[PDB]
């Protein structure tokens, strides 16, 4: 897999080489056409992991990702050509390529072997990801975000380091291969029990938890839009990905070690849920959605039943892609607004007729409606949390009326309503802003047509 | 020697305490400094003397020869401080906190 | 609308000479620029 | 009696087996 | 030592003088040179971890 | 090319990988036996250079 | 007070420029940053990846699978062996604790 | 005179708590005469007295965190009957920052210091109980 | 143009020289090196 | 550490022996990461000094480009070493003490009984 | 200074340190050790201000009785072993001596009141040797005697250096001081792993020369002694912008930089030797000192400061500038860490 | 090409490099070439290897 990395790299070069006028054609253009070469990994014919080389692998749960993470760089340089198109022309070189590094660490943070390999680039990704906050942020507090962002991740982050490198004396070699066809079976002593939470709590933090999720709604409230793009999208999802990785060893633990986070989990799906239901900031509301249904991922990466772990990789691809639309058209609303509140805008569709229709899908998309790859998952994690114990279905039951409640809240208070009398006036949409969106849908409805691409490793 | 080192070792820690804990002028803390020189010159030389080790002897005076510029260092430094602050006192050496 | 760039209050708190100022610590100030004093 | 010298690795150098093994570097 | 300058230039400035039973002048013998050499003749080739 | 290339070169990637365990750990080991043992080349610390010791006929009798 | 700037206003770029397309300012950008957005965007993204991935052929094995099953049930049922029976890998083969 | 601390650990948890409490008693107080010197040689005081009234602050402070850490570690065990329970230790740990928050005068470091100093007790007894090396001879 | 006339309106041909000269030398001493080296290994060992 | 090895050159930067191993491919990645890693200096250089970054320094960019590649070849050729006297000193420990490193033996999964937790 | 004082001088600073390393009769080490010290008193007044003064005559009563420490170990072991050199069978008191002078010299934890105060009071550039080149020679008198040392103490200076050094530099604004934490901080490190792996010490050490040497030069191309001084980098020298925010933040341990490799190679033997206590706290309260490290990337690069109007005129005026050492010594420290596995 | 017609090729090269550098993996990890077990056969006439 160097032709979804090293074409990437080569991007580098071009928007610094490239002339001021002609930069962004040519990145944009360019990493469309790396987003195609990185289909080409979708074509695996037998059920053995695709081993490229030794260091570079690309197995059912990273393909699924590292397509999204190559796809969205296009978007994220199309929804940042207006804001960032104020800037002294090497301030842009500086945003786009920033924006390229991100995907071309994430890409191979998906698709690496060694766990270590993951963590380098895995704690990597907050360099760009904080300069894109910190540097670019509109207001005041993001100085405040980069900290919490760059902390939480950090203390986590330290304790994971101790505990690879624990393993590698332990068994010898942090191959994900090996170390899956090798016997690492804790004890559970109450050392391991410690190790365990080592390997597992730094994913949690970016998988917003509920005990430490408070970074991400500071992050994204600030944070540029393709910075709370990259966050909700790819981002947040490492998390994810480690946890599937890194618990094939420490085994034994998890049947009862989990129940702590599992618990945390649920009834933190319902309250972060719930006060995305009195939230007045529209991008505060579409974070703390993330926190919530990405409580549902840590609580199907924990239960470990096959439907799980495929609910987890359908809906975390999906969420992804629903999140930044829902990220997106919050910050096109923004720009023309000036303001994040929910409050102001009212009644948009009357003068942006099409921008609600992206609004309305992203909803139905954001709530489970039933064609759609955001239903099956949550379906399917719902199922196993039941297996778990019956009564998971009140928790997750509280969860999808709530849901189901701030979703369309969004839709009534922001796009629907008498309109607002006269704010600026609101420009008309730009075609940009419309395509960012409809391709962050297109695919929503394709990938619909055939889940079983993003199906995760269990199934 | 038995007994004999253990005096001068003790001086030495007694000149040790005596660096080691200010009190107002600065030159009575080199010159306690100095005293250690002393101390550890008379330790090396009656040992090289009792082990018979001649070849040895030379470094009894090398520790002197380094010692004497060590305090020409340290008294210049003393001038100046009683240049600039009119006393060697070393509460007014506190500028840097 | 600019991203906040910091005003000269921001500013102010890294001067001092010293970031967390303590109950008797505040009560110094800053070092002088030329490294040379007054007294 | 005085001890035996430790003994002597012997042989010519080859490279290194699989090289630096390091971290991830296939090198 | 930590930057052996001595050994490579063949130099020995400071090696000749390190123990009792160095050459000490006009061939006085030290004290205890009935032992020294007994114990760094010994502990040649072994290292410390079993000259110990 | 096919589902014979990639099996075949995961199984090399596997066989590197493994060898690679096997001595990393054999390592640790070793370097454990040569520190207390000091019967290797490696933690050899150093003593006195019987070069310098005199063994010349020296003025008294007993040297 | 400090110097520094007025806050800018934000240009109305759809009042020069009425076919802004959103991407630059000047119109010969924005066109030719449109036409190549859309095309390598939707064109040949949505429309040659699709049907490339469409055409992946028994992904994951599982068009493969639905005929093992059924030729394995076809030998199975024919010649009277369970279709799928309860231990698969063989006890012989297993030498269990013998406490 | 070291023999004696390590005492400590020799007799089983939860038993002997009279002994486990002037040892952790007088850890405590050795570290409270430490704490206390290096705050007086540094950040010295106005009088002698005023000083040595320091010393004696925060060697009882510290002596009363080492008995009830002591004391409550010792009593939960007999108590709970668990004589080897991390948790044990917790419950001391938490006592110990609730008396140093007392002595500071102040609810929310006690509440600091029930964690941290819990949590810190407890890893303690993992550490025993694990054996966990600490300041480990080179083994390579 | 500049009323201080820049120290570097003209290049220091000798910086040129030595820096151009100096590089072409590394190059075939390493390139010699290396062919050399080669060679030695081939030999030392069987080839 | 490897220091103390019999025979160890006491200052030399790479003993001949070395010459047994084979020479670094100039074109090992790593000597073209120290060349990409060398133009950047030079490129940084011209930056921080107000050049143009790119059209500069063209004769400074080849020394940059050439003397860190330069350098690459002379120690890869050493770390190389370095890392085959480890095994040379490592493999032949594990025979010349082989007790104390013997072949284990492992049995077939069948034998072994590995304890089988249920997920449920 | 009369050019001829600044040729012996420099020189004696520079044969300080090298007699340290070259001979192995301790007395000559005791001299190197010596000589360093006469040769550092000189430079450090050059300004002559009275805070100089003041620097001065901290530094050499602190190095003096440490050095005289040092000798009392010789002293000692003369009579111990007719030897003028540590042997395995040193008394242990013995060699705490010698690590609490020496790190008393390298002002390392307990005895780190010093440094962070002469490093205050010193011009940039005599900040530099009185960091990064006065910490060779000590290190390598503890190198060598590594095989002897105690593994308690070691760490206990170590850990209390990372912490004292992270502590200390989150309040301090000053950047010379600054530096000074966070080289108490990386001594630290270095210091912990000398029983273990000798080797690391050397490669920790260097890392951290190739970081603070380019750190400085940045500090003094606009001698900018605070961080509002060096806030306005922006306007002074826009380009070191960039490469001094990764400098920072490679000083600190996070992972694609050079700075994480001594990190992640000395947890890696420190684990291997089985302390996963004691190197899990050195790396937590390691990511302290990031936090000041980007307080200050906060001030000079991520948000611009206001300027002054009269810095238009110095923008005006052509830069003198920066030597080719930052930009070498930046880069091979801003990013090698592709090339691990052959430094260490 | 070099009228902007060459900062349009530094991609696509990219991609071509990979391709290269791609493929050389292969021939690294070419043991076990044709010698795994479920797909071992004997090299059919004219063929020396079974894949490249
Ligand atoms: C600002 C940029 C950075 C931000 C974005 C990227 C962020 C990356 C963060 C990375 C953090 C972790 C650091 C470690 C990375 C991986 C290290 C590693 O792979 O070690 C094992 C590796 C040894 O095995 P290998 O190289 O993977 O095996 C390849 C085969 O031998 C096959 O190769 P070969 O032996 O056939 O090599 C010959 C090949 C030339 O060889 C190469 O250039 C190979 C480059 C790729 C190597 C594989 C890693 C790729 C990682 C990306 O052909 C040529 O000689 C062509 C002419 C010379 C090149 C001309 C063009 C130069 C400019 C392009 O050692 C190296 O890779 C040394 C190079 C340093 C690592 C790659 C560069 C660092 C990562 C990108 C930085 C970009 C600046
Ligand atoms: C050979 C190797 C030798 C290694 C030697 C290492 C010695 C380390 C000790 C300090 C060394 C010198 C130094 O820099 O200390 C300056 C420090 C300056 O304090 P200060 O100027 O007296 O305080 C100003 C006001 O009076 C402050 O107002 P305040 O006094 O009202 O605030 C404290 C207040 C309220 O207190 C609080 O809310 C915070 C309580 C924190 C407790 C834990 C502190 C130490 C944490 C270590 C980790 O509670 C009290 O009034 C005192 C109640 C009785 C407390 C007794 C605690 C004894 C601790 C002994 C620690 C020994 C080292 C471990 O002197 C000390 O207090 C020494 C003990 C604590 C040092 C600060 C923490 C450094 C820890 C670094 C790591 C050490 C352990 C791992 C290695
Ligand atoms: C984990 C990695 C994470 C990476 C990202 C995060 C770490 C880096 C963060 C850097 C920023 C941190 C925050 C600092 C403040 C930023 C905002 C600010 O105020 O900056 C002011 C600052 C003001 O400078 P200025 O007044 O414009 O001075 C320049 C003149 O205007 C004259 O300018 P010009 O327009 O004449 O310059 C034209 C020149 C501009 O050239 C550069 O600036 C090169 C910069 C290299 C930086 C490397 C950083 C590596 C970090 C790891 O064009 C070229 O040289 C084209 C080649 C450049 C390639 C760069 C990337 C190569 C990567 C490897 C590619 C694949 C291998 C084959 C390459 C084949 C090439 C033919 O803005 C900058 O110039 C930033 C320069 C550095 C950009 C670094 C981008 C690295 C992307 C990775
Ligand atoms: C890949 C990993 C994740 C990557 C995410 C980002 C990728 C972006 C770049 C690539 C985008 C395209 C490639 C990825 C998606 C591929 C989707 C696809 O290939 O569709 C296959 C479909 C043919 O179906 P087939 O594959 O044969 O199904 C198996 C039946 N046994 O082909 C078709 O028939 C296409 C038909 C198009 C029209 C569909 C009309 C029906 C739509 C139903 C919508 C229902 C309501 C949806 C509600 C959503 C929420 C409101
Ligand atoms: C916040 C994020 C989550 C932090 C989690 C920290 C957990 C402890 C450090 C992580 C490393 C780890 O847990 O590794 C396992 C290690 C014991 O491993 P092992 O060698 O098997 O020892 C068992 C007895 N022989 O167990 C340990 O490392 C114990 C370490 C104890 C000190 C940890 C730091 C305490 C700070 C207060
Ligand atoms: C010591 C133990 C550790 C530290 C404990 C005290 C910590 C707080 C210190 C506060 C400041 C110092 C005053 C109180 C300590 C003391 O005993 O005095 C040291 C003395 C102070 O000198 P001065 O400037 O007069 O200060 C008077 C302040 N009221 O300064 C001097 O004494 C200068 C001479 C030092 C050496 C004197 C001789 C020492 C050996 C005496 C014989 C052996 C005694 C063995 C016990
Ligand atoms: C998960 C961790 C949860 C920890 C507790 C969270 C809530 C803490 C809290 O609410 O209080 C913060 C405390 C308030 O204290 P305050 O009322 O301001 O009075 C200070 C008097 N010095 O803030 C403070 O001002 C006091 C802070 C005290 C810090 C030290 C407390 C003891 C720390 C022991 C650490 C471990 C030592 C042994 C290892």
Same mark, same amino acid.
């Given at each position: 897999?160097?032709?979804?990395?090293?074409?990437?790299?080569?991007?580098?070069?071009?928007?610094?080489?490239?002339?001021?006028?002609?930069?962004?054609?040519?990145?944009?253009?360019?990493?469309?056409?790396?987003?195609?070469?990185?289909?080409?990994?979708?074509?695996?014919?037998?059920?053995?992991?695709?081993?490229?080389?030794?260091?570079?692998?690309?197995?059912?749960?990273?393909?699924?990702?590292?397509?999204?993470?190559?796809?969205?760089?296009?978007?994220?340089?199309?929804?940042?050509?207006?804001?960032?198109?104020?800037?002294?022309?090497?301030?842009?070189?500086?945003?786009?390529?920033?924006?390229?590094?991100?995907?071309?660490?994430?890409?191979?943070?998906?698709?690496?072997?060694?766990?270590?390999?993951?963590?380098?680039?895995?704690?990597?990704?907050?360099?760009?990801?904080?300069?894109?906050?910190?540097?670019?942020?509109?207001?005041?507090?993001?100085?405040?975000?980069?900290?919490?962002?760059?902390?939480?991740?950090?203390?986590?982050?330290?304790?994971?380091?101790?505990?690879?490198?624990?393993?590698?004396?332990h068994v010898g070699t942090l191959n994900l291969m090996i170390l899956s066809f090798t016997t690492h079976t804790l004890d559970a002593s109450w050392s391991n029990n410690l190790l365990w939470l080592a390997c597992m709590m730094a994913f949690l933090i970016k998988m917003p938890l509920y005990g430490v999720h408070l970074w991400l709604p500071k992050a994204h409230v600030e944070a540029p839009i393709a910075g709370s793009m990259i966050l909700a999208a790819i981002l947040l999802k490492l998390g994810s990905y480690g946890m599937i990785r890194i618990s094939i060893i420490l085994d034994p633990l998890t049947k009862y070690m989990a129940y702590p986070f599992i618990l945390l989990s649920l009834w933190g799906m319902i309250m972060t849920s719930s006060i995305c239901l009195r939230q007045t900031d529209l991008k505060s509301l579409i974070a703390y959605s993330s926190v919530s249904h990405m409580a549902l991922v840590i609580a199907s990466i924990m239960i470990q039943t096959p439907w799980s772990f495929m609910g987890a990789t359908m809906l975390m691809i999906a969420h992804g892609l629903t999140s930044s639309l829902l990220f997106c058209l919050a910050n096109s609303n923004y720009e023309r607004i000036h303001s994040r509140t929910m409050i102001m805008a009212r009644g948009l569709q009357m003068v942006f007729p099409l921008m609600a229709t992206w609004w309305l899908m992203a909803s139905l998309a954001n709530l489970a409606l039933p064609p759609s790859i955001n239903l099956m998952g949550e379906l399917f994690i719902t199922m196993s949390l039941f297996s778990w114990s019956n009564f998971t279905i009140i928790l997750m039951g509280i969860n999808i009326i709530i849901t189901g409640m701030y979703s369309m809240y969004m839709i009534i208070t922001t796009q629907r309503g008498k309109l607002t009398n006269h704010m600026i006036n609101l420009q008309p949409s730009h075609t940009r802003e419309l395509t960012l969106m409809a391709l962050h849908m297109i695919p929503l409805i394709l990938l619909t047509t055939s889940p079983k691409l993003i199906t995760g490793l269990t199934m | 020697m038995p007994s004999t080192f253990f005096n001068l070792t003790m001086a030495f820690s007694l000149s040790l305490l005596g660096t080691l804990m200010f009190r107002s002028h600065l030159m009575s803390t080199l010159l306690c400094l100095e005293g250690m020189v002393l101390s550890l010159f008379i330790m090396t030389s009656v040992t090289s003397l009792n082990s018979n080790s001649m070849s040895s002897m030379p470094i009894p005076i090398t520790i002197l020869v380094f010692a004497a510029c060590e305090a020409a260092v340290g008294l210049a430094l003393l001038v100046k401080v009683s240049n600039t602050y009119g006393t060697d006192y070393v509460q007014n050496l506190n500028l840097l906190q | 609308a600019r991203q906040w760039q910091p005003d000269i209050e921001w500013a102010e708190?890294?001067?001092?000479?010293?970031?967390?100022?303590?109950?008797?610590?505040?009560?110094?100030?800053?070092?002088?620029?030329?490294?040379?004093?007054?007294? | 009696?005085?001890?035996?010298?430790?003994?002597?690795?012997?042989?010519?150098?080859?490279?290194?087996?699989?090289?630096?093994?390091?971290?991830?570097?296939?090198? | 030592?930590?930057?052996?300058?001595?050994?490579?230039?063949?130099?020995?400035?400071?090696?000749?003088?390190?123990?009792?039973?160095?050459?000490?002048?006009?061939?006085?013998?030290?004290?205890?040179?009935?032992?020294?050499?007994?114990?760094?003749?010994?502990?040649?080739?072994?290292?410390?971890?079993?000259?110990? | 090319?096919?589902?014979?290339?990639?099996?075949?070169?995961?199984?090399?990637?596997?066989?590197?990988?493994?060898?690679?365990?096997?001595?990393?750990?054999?390592?640790?080991?070793?370097?454990?036996?040569?520190?207390?043992?000091?019967?290797?080349?490696?933690?050899?610390?150093?003593?006195?250079?019987?070069?310098?010791?005199?063994?010349?006929?020296?003025?008294?009798?007993?040297? | 007070?400090?110097?520094?700037?007025?806050?800018?206003?934000?240009?109305?770029?759809?009042?020069?420029?009425?076919?802004?397309?959103?991407?630059?300012?000047?119109?010969?950008?924005?066109?030719?940053?449109?036409?190549?957005?859309?095309?390598?965007?939707?064109?040949?993204?949505?429309?040659?990846?699709?049907?490339?991935?469409?055409?992946?052929?028994?992904?994951?094995?599982?068009?493969?699978?639905?005929?093992?099953?059924?030729?394995?049930?076809?030998?199975?049922?024919?010649?009277?062996?369970?279709?799928?029976?309860?231990?698969?890998?063989?006890?012989?083969?297993?030498?269990?604790?013998?406490? | 005179?070291?023999?004696?601390?390590?005492?400590?650990?020799?007799?089983?948890?939860?038993?002997?708590?009279?002994?486990?409490?002037?040892?952790?008693?007088?850890?405590?107080?050795?570290?409270?005469?430490?704490?206390?010197?290096?705050?007086?040689?540094?950040?010295?005081?106005?009088?002698?007295?005023?000083?040595?009234?320091?010393?004696?602050?925060?060697?009882?402070?510290?002596?009363?965190?080492?008995?009830?850490?002591?004391?409550?570690?010792?009593?939960?065990?007999?108590?709970?009957?668990?004589?080897?329970?991390?948790?044990?230790?917790?419950?001391?740990?938490?006592?110990?920052?609730?008396?140093?928050?007392?002595?500071?005068?102040?609810?929310?470091?006690?509440?600091?210091?029930?964690?941290?100093?819990?949590?810190?007790?407890?890893?303690?007894?993992?550490?025993?109980?694990?054996?966990?090396?600490?300041?480990?001879?080179?083994?390579? | 143009?500049?009323?201080?006339?820049?120290?570097?309106?003209?290049?220091?041909?000798?910086?040129?020289?030595?820096?151009?000269?100096?590089?072409?030398?590394?190059?075939?001493?390493?390139?010699?090196?290396?062919?050399?080296?080669?060679?030695?290994?081939?030999?030392?060992?069987?080839? | 550490?490897?220091?103390?090895?019999?025979?160890?050159?006491?200052?030399?930067?790479?003993?001949?022996?070395?010459?047994?191993?084979?020479?670094?491919?100039?074109?090992?990645?790593?000597?073209?990461?120290?060349?990409?890693?060398?133009?950047?200096?030079?490129?940084?250089?011209?930056?921080?000094?107000?050049?143009?970054?790119?059209?500069?320094?063209?004769?400074?960019?080849?020394?940059?480009?050439?003397?860190?590649?330069?350098?690459?070849?002379?120690?890869?050729?050493?770390?190389?070493?370095?890392?085959?006297?480890?095994?040379?000193?490592?493999?032949?420990?594990?025979?010349?003490?082989?007790?104390?490193?013997?072949?284990?033996?492992?049995?077939?999964?069948?034998?072994?009984?590995?304890?089988?937790?249920?997920?449920? | 200074?009369?050019?001829?004082?600044?040729?012996?001088?420099?020189?004696?600073?520079?044969?300080?340190?090298?007699?340290?390393?070259?001979?192995?009769?301790?007395?000559?080490?005791?001299?190197?050790?010596?000589?360093?010290?006469?040769?550092?008193?000189?430079?450090?007044?050059?300004?002559?201000?009275?805070?100089?003064?003041?620097?001065?005559?901290?530094?050499?009563?602190?190095?003096?009785?440490?050095?005289?420490?040092?000798?009392?170990?010789?002293?000692?072991?003369?009579?111990?072993?007719?030897?003028?050199?540590?042997?395995?069978?040193?008394?242990?008191?013995?060699?705490?001596?010698?690590?609490?002078?020496?790190?008393?010299?390298?002002?390392?934890?307990?005895?780190?009141?010093?440094?962070?105060?002469?490093?205050?009071?010193?011009?940039?550039?005599?900040?530099?040797?009185?960091?990064?080149?006065?910490?060779?020679?000590?290190?390598?008198?503890?190198?060598?005697?590594?095989?002897?040392?105690?593994?308690?103490?070691?760490?206990?200076?170590?850990?209390?250096?990372?912490?004292?050094?992270?502590?200390?530099?989150?309040?301090?604004?000053?950047?010379?001081?600054?530096?000074?934490?966070?080289?108490?901080?990386?001594?630290?490190?270095?210091?912990?792993?000398?029983?273990?792996?000798?080797?690391?010490?050397?490669?920790?050490?260097?890392?951290?020369?190739?970081?603070?040497?380019?750190?400085?030069?940045?500090?003094?191309?606009?001698?900018?002694?605070?961080?509002?001084?060096?806030?306005?980098?922006?306007?002074?020298?826009?380009?070191?912008?960039?490469?001094?925010?990764?400098?920072?933040?490679?000083?600190?341990?996070?992972?694609?930089?050079?700075?994480?490799?001594?990190?992640?190679?000395?947890?890696?033997?420190?684990?291997?030797?089985?302390?996963?206590?004691?190197?899990?706290?050195?790396?937590?309260?390691?990511?302290?000192?990031?936090?000041?490290?980007?307080?200050?990337?906060?001030?000079?690069?991520?948000?611009?400061?206001?300027?002054?109007?009269?810095?238009?005129?110095?923008?005006?005026?052509?830069?003198?500038?920066?030597?080719?050492?930052?930009?070498?010594?930046?880069?091979?420290?801003?990013?090698?860490?592709?090339?691990?596995?052959?430094?260490? | 090409?070099?009228?902007?017609?060459?900062?349009?090729?530094?991609?696509?090269?990219? %991609?071509?490099?990979?391709?290269?550098?791609?493929?050389?993996?292969?021939? #690294?990890?070419?043991?076990?070439?044709?010698?795994?077990?479920? %797909?071992?056969?004997?090299?059919?006439?004219?063929?020396?290897?079974?894949? #490249?």
């Amino acid at each position: 897999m160097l032709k979804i990395i090293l074409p990437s790299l080569m991007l580098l070069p071009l928007t610094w080489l490239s002339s001021p006028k002609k930069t962004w054609t040519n990145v944009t253009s360019y990493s469309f056409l790396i987003s195609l070469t990185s289909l080409t990994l979708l074509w695996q014919t037998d059920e053995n992991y695709k081993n490229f080389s030794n260091m570079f692998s690309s197995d059912p749960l990273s393909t699924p990702l590292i397509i999204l993470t190559a796809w969205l760089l296009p978007l994220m340089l199309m929804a940042s050509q207006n804001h960032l198109k104020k800037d002294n022309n090497v301030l842009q070189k500086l945003y786009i390529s920033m924006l390229i590094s991100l995907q071309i660490l994430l890409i191979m943070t998906f698709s690496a072997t060694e766990l270590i390999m993951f963590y380098i680039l895995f704690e990597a990704t907050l360099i760009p990801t904080l300069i894109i906050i910190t540097r670019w942020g509109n207001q005041t507090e993001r100085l405040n975000a980069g900290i919490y962002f760059l902390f939480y991740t950090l203390i986590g982050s330290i304790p994971l380091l101790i505990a690879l490198i624990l393993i590698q004396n332990h068994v010898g070699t942090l191959n994900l291969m090996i170390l899956s066809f090798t016997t690492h079976t804790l004890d559970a002593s109450w050392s391991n029990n410690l190790l365990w939470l080592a390997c597992m709590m730094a994913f949690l933090i970016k998988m917003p938890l509920y005990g430490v999720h408070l970074w991400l709604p500071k992050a994204h409230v600030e944070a540029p839009i393709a910075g709370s793009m990259i966050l909700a999208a790819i981002l947040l999802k490492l998390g994810s990905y480690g946890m599937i990785r890194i618990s094939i060893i420490l085994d034994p633990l998890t049947k009862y070690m989990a129940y702590p986070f599992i618990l945390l989990s649920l009834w933190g799906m319902i309250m972060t849920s719930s006060i995305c239901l009195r939230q007045t900031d529209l991008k505060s509301l579409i974070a703390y959605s993330s926190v919530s249904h990405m409580a549902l991922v840590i609580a199907s990466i924990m239960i470990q039943t096959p439907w799980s772990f495929m609910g987890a990789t359908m809906l975390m691809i999906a969420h992804g892609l629903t999140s930044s639309l829902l990220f997106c058209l919050a910050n096109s609303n923004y720009e023309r607004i000036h303001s994040r509140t929910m409050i102001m805008a009212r009644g948009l569709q009357m003068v942006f007729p099409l921008m609600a229709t992206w609004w309305l899908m992203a909803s139905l998309a954001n709530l489970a409606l039933p064609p759609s790859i955001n239903l099956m998952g949550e379906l399917f994690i719902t199922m196993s949390l039941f297996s778990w114990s019956n009564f998971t279905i009140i928790l997750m039951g509280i969860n999808i009326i709530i849901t189901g409640m701030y979703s369309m809240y969004m839709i009534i208070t922001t796009q629907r309503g008498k309109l607002t009398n006269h704010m600026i006036n609101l420009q008309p949409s730009h075609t940009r802003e419309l395509t960012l969106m409809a391709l962050h849908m297109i695919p929503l409805i394709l990938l619909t047509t055939s889940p079983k691409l993003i199906t995760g490793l269990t199934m | 020697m038995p007994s004999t080192f253990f005096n001068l070792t003790m001086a030495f820690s007694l000149s040790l305490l005596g660096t080691l804990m200010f009190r107002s002028h600065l030159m009575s803390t080199l010159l306690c400094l100095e005293g250690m020189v002393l101390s550890l010159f008379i330790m090396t030389s009656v040992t090289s003397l009792n082990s018979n080790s001649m070849s040895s002897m030379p470094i009894p005076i090398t520790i002197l020869v380094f010692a004497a510029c060590e305090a020409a260092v340290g008294l210049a430094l003393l001038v100046k401080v009683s240049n600039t602050y009119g006393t060697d006192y070393v509460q007014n050496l506190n500028l840097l906190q | 609308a600019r991203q906040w760039q910091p005003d000269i209050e921001w500013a102010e708190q890294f001067s001092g000479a010293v970031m967390y100022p303590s109950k008797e610590t505040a009560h110094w100030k800053p070092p002088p620029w030329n490294d040379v004093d007054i007294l | 009696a005085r001890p035996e010298p430790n003994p002597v690795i012997e042989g010519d150098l080859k490279p290194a087996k699989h090289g630096t093994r390091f971290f991830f570097w296939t090198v | 030592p930590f930057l052996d300058i001595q050994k490579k230039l063949g130099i020995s400035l400071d090696r000749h003088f390190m123990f009792l039973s160095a050459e000490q002048p006009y061939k006085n013998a030290a004290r205890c040179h009935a032992f020294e050499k007994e114990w760094i003749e010994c502990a040649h080739g072994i290292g410390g971890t079993r000259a110990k | 090319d096919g589902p014979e290339k990639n099996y075949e070169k995961t199984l090399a990637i596997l066989q590197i990988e493994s060898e690679k365990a096997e001595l990393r750990l054999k390592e640790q080991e070793v370097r454990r036996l040569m520190r207390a043992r000091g019967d290797g080349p490696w933690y050899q610390f150093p003593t006195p250079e019987k070069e310098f010791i005199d063994h010349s006929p020296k003025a008294t009798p007993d040297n | 007070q400090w110097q520094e700037d007025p806050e800018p206003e934000d240009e109305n770029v759809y009042a020069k420029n009425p076919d802004f397309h959103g991407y630059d300012s000047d119109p010969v950008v924005d066109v030719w940053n449109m036409r190549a957005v859309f095309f390598f965007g939707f064109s040949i993204v949505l429309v040659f990846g699709t049907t490339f991935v469409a055409y992946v052929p028994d992904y994951r094995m599982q068009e493969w699978a639905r005929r093992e099953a059924e030729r394995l049930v076809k030998y199975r049922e024919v010649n009277g062996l369970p279709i799928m029976e309860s231990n698969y890998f063989d006890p012989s083969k297993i030498q269990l604790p013998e406490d | 005179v070291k023999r004696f601390f390590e005492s400590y650990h020799e007799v089983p948890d939860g038993t002997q708590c009279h002994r486990k409490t002037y040892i952790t008693t007088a850890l405590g107080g050795i570290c409270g005469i430490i704490g206390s010197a290096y705050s007086v040689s540094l950040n010295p005081a106005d009088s002698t007295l005023e000083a040595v009234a320091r010393v004696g602050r925060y060697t009882f402070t510290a002596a009363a965190i080492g008995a009830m850490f002591g004391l409550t570690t010792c009593v939960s065990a007999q108590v709970r009957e668990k004589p080897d329970d991390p948790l044990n230790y917790f419950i001391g740990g938490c006592a110990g920052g609730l008396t140093l928050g007392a002595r500071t005068h102040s609810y929310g470091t006690a509440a600091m210091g029930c964690v941290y100093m819990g949590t810190a007790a407890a890893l303690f007894k993992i550490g025993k109980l694990e054996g966990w090396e600490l300041f480990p001879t080179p083994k390579v | 143009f500049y009323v201080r006339e820049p120290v570097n309106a003209k290049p220091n041909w000798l910086a040129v020289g030595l820096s151009v000269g100096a590089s072409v030398f590394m190059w075939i001493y390493l390139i010699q090196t290396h062919n050399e080296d080669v060679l030695e290994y081939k030999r030392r060992n069987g080839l | 550490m490897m220091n103390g090895r019999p025979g160890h050159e006491p200052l030399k930067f790479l003993p001949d022996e070395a010459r047994s191993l084979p020479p670094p491919k100039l074109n090992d990645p790593r000597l073209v990461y120290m060349g990409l890693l060398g133009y950047c200096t030079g490129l940084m250089d011209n930056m921080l000094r107000m050049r143009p970054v790119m059209r500069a320094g063209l004769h400074r960019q080849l020394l940059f480009v050439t003397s860190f590649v330069f350098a690459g070849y002379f120690y890869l050729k050493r770390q190389n070493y370095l890392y085959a006297v480890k095994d040379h000193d490592m493999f032949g420990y594990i025979k010349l003490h082989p007790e104390d490193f013997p072949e284990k033996e492992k049995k077939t999964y069948a034998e072994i009984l590995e304890p089988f937790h249920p997920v449920r | 200074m009369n050019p001829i004082t600044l040729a012996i001088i420099y020189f004696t600073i520079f044969l300080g340190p090298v007699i340290t390393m070259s001979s192995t009769n301790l007395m000559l080490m005791w001299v190197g050790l010596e000589f360093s010290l006469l040769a550092i008193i000189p430079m450090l007044i050059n300004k002559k201000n009275p805070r100089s003064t003041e620097a001065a005559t901290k530094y050499f009563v602190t190095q003096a009785t440490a050095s005289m420490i040092i000798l009392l170990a010789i002293v000692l072991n003369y009579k111990q072993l007719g030897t003028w050199m540590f042997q395995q069978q040193t008394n242990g008191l013995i060699l705490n001596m010698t690590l609490m002078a020496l790190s008393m010299k390298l002002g390392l934890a307990p005895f780190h009141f010093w440094l962070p105060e002469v490093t205050q009071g010193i011009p940039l550039h005599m900040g530099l040797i009185l960091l990064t080149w006065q910490k060779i020679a000590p290190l390598s008198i503890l190198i060598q005697i590594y095989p002897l040392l105690n593994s308690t103490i070691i760490l206990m200076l170590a850990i209390t250096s990372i912490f004292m050094g992270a502590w200390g530099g989150l309040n301090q604004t000053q950047m010379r001081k600054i530096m000074a934490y966070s080289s108490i901080a990386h001594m630290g490190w270095m210091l912990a792993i000398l029983p273990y792996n000798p080797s690391l010490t050397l490669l920790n050490l260097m890392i951290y020369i190739i970081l603070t040497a380019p750190m400085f030069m940045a500090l003094m191309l606009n001698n900018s002694m605070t961080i509002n001084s060096i806030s306005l980098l922006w306007n002074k020298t826009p380009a070191m912008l960039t490469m001094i925010s990764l400098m920072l933040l490679s000083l600190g341990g996070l992972p694609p930089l050079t700075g994480f490799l001594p990190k992640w190679i000395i947890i890696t033997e420190l684990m291997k030797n089985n302390c996963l206590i004691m190197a899990t706290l050195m790396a937590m309260m390691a990511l302290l000192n990031l936090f000041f490290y980007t307080r200050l990337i906060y001030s000079t690069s991520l948000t611009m400061f206001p300027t002054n109007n009269n810095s238009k005129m110095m923008t005006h005026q052509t830069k003198t500038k920066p030597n080719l050492m930052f930009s070498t010594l930046a880069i091979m420290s801003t990013m090698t860490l592709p090339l691990a596995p052959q430094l260490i | 090409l070099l009228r902007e017609h060459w900062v349009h090729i530094l991609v696509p090269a990219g %991609f071509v490099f990979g391709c290269y550098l791609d493929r050389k993996d292969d021939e #690294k990890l070419t043991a076990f070439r044709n010698k795994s077990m479920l %797909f071992q056969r004997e090299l059919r006439p004219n063929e020396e290897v079974t894949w #490249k």
